Amino acid sequence: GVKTEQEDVLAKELEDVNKWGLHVFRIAELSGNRPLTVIMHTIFQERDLLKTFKIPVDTLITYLMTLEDHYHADVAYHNNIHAADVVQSTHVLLSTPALEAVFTDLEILAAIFASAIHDVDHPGVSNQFLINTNSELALMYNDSSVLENHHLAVGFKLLQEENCDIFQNLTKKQRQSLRKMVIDIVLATDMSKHMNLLADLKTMVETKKVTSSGVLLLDNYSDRIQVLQNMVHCADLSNPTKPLQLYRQWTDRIMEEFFRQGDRERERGMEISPMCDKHNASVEKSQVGFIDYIVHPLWETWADLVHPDAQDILDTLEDNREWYQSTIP
Ligand SMILES: [Mg+2]
Ligand SMILES: [Zn+2]
Secondary structure: OOOOHHHHHHHHHHHHOOOOOOOHHHHHHHOOOOHHHHHHHHHHHHOOHHHHHOOOHHHHHHHHHHHHHOOOOOOOOOOHHHHHHHHHHHHHHHOOHHHOOOOOHHHHHHHHHHHHHOOOOOOOOOHHHHHHOOOHHHHHOOOOOHHHHHHHHHHHHHHHOOOOOOOOOOOHHHHHHHHHHHHHHHHOOOHHHHHHHHHHHHHHHHOOOEOOOOOEOOOOHHHHHHHHHHHHHHHHOOHHHOOHHHHHHHHHHHHHHHHHHHHHHHHOOOOOOOOOOOOOOOHHHHHHHHHHHHHHHHHHHHHHHOOOOOHHHHHHHHHHHHHHHOOOO
């Protein structure tokens, strides 16, 4: 009737679910490689989303396990642990004081569902690799946000498996709005969209308006979805902002995945993609470059939007950047 000793240690780790720096690798081990299922279940309960959207709990668990099973266990980075991490990171960003009572239950559901599906069935190679090899996926999506289109299509298609339709009790109006937001969020995870997303976030910080209660004013769809898009984008680019023990595990994983792509490119006589050549790699210099050109400008702009809620996240990012700089040989 009550939990095993393993289930109890897992539940104690899940008490950090509202904190930046959750031990997500430990949750992966303890859950029997079910980090996405257990973290999504915990967040759905915590935010009362089963009651709000009348999601049968058996349907939720069946869908979450099905979704987790369509992440590839042999992919070192773009797997269920990364999905779980982005979900939990989105969950913390949604709870930021500057956004209190800003977003509806449906918008919260969209951002979390989007986070959960955002990399499903990732083959561990880039859009460019799928385009250059003339893959079926690239043919299907006309070389345009190939992986991100595929993630969405799989995330939604899995709702049609036996007892998997977690949206069965939503009205058509709820479903159409949820779907448009989830699509808008996942398509924005394509790094080709980063510069336009960041420009729009900066424009929003420059024209920023606050309510009498001190929270952000977002009074049109365009502004609301832009913030959710940048939020899930920040969660996706949050590794360098985590405590260094977590950041370094993510770096080991992305470099294993990139080097594997580089090995496949070299064996096929293809040009080796940036940072994918294990014989010509500067892990440390690449991380400092990633932080300086991509991650820090994004998180600095996010920190301005929700000032001062993200100051400790930005501090961890700057400390991690200095640590990698100090190890450049
Ligand atoms: Mg992705
Ligand atoms: Zn991702």
